[PDB]
Amino acid sequence: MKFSAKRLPSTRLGTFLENRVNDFLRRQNHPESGEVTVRVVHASDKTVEVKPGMKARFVDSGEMAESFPYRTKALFAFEEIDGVDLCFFGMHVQEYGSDCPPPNQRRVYISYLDSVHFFRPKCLRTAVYHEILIGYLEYVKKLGYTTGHIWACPPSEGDDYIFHCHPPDQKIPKPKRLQEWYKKMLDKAVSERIVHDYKDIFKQATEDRLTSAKELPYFEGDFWPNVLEESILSQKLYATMEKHKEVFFVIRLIAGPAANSLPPIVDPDPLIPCDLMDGRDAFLTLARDKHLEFSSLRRAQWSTGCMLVELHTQSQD
Ligand SMILES: NS(=O)(=O)c1ccc(CCN[C@@H](C(=O)c2c[nH]c3ccccc23)c2ccccc2)cc1
Ligand SMILES: [Cl-]
Ligand SMILES: [Cl-]
């Protein structure tokens, strides 16, 4: 292969995740399984500027910063089936480091999560996604991020997160499974002493004695900005946090004393400037354009190829 998944530029994140997976796979000793290559394909710096009315209430009065500088990263899992690569799992993340003011100091928030259900074998499918996610929650806990945040949100019909045109027979999870599927992922992270504990947003906030909306983390296109702005008031937020708690996790990686003695986070990985994988829209555009689909396996093997072709010559700029 001239343009293969492996032959993409490596990173310390990319190598850390693909290790834990092949480590997990090799011990399972299923003969159908194959090599999983994990790559970071976009890393850049960004901010999430506070919205007009939250701004007016707290930013203008001095009590809150006007924006929060995070690093965005896009990363993809590729299996080798029939001796050809298959992009099976993508993930977009916001990383708010130590130099970020509160209340985004040392937090990761997963922008987006997606899959194409042709990972082999299909019994290890869900298991492998869990490794990639615990592997990311482990990686960042070691760099020294205290808290992770997940919006447990299933996709809508007629719209896709990352991959254009999913398999017709790959069913979307109903809210209650997706919640159980994350709880499934986390309870395993807890047993490996990676996660200290996790809580729904309401319980976390009930136990952190939050008395102001400026204390609630403020992520890019997360639910809670839109709620606070549509609210324009602490009660209103305790109503909404309570009603929706089950969808919004707070994953504590570093706890108690060890959280206050932290040296500053230093991401060792360099920035990967990539036009295509800057947010979800530009990649969905290219796939729509060039008639690409992840509908069938052979179609998905086609698409990963034309995805990599485009990636290797946009890096070469
Ligand atoms: N709870 S579960 O055990 O069923 C399960 C299994 C695997 C996964 C891994 C991620 N999978 C995607 C996903 O399927 C889809 C995204 N866009 C779609 C459009 C049409 C049909 C499907 C998709 C996904 C699903 C939910 C939320 C984000 C991304 C997740 C959950
Ligand atoms: Cl998601
Ligand atoms: Cl983005």
Side-chain angles (χ1 to χ4, degrees), residues 9 59 106 110 123 133 146 160 172 178 188 210 225 243 247 267 270 290 297:
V59 172
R106 303 192 170 258
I110 320 180
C123 27
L133 268 175
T146 59
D160 344 54
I172 319 194
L178 194 63
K188 190 158 193 275
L210 178 138
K243 190 168 154 165
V247 171
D267 178 30
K290 292 158 138 284
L297 178 45

Side-chain angles (χ1 to χ4, degrees), residues 80-81 83-98 100-104 106-112:
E80 166 248 317
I81 317 171
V84 190
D85 302 340
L86 168 68
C87 182
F88 72 82
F89 182 90
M91 200 185 64
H92 282 233
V93 294
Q94 300 170 46
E95 284 162 327
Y96 302 81
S98 66
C100 187
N104 293 9
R106 303 192 170 258
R107 295 185 189 283
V108 301
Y109 164 79
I110 320 180
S111 304
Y112 295 122

Side-chain angles (χ1 to χ4, degrees), residues 150-156 158 160-164:
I150 290 176
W151 193 350
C153 216
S156 297
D160 344 54
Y161 277 128
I162 296 184
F163 307 114
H164 177 269

Side-chain angles (χ1 to χ4, degrees), residues 113-115 129 153 155 161 166 170 172-173 177-178 181:
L113 200 129
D114 211 346
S115 72
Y129 300 145
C153 216
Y161 277 128
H166 286 73
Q170 189 191 349
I172 319 194
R177 327 183 45 199
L178 194 63
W181 184 82

Side-chain angles (χ1 to χ4, degrees), residues 136-156:
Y136 175 89
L137 283 185
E138 187 174 43
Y139 186 82
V140 293
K141 173 180 151 153
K142 183 155 49 51
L143 294 204
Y145 296 85
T146 59
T147 317
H149 304 263
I150 290 176
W151 193 350
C153 216
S156 297

Side-chain angles (χ1 to χ4, degrees), residues 46 72 92 278-279:
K46 290 224 216 295
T72 194
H92 282 233
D278 185 27

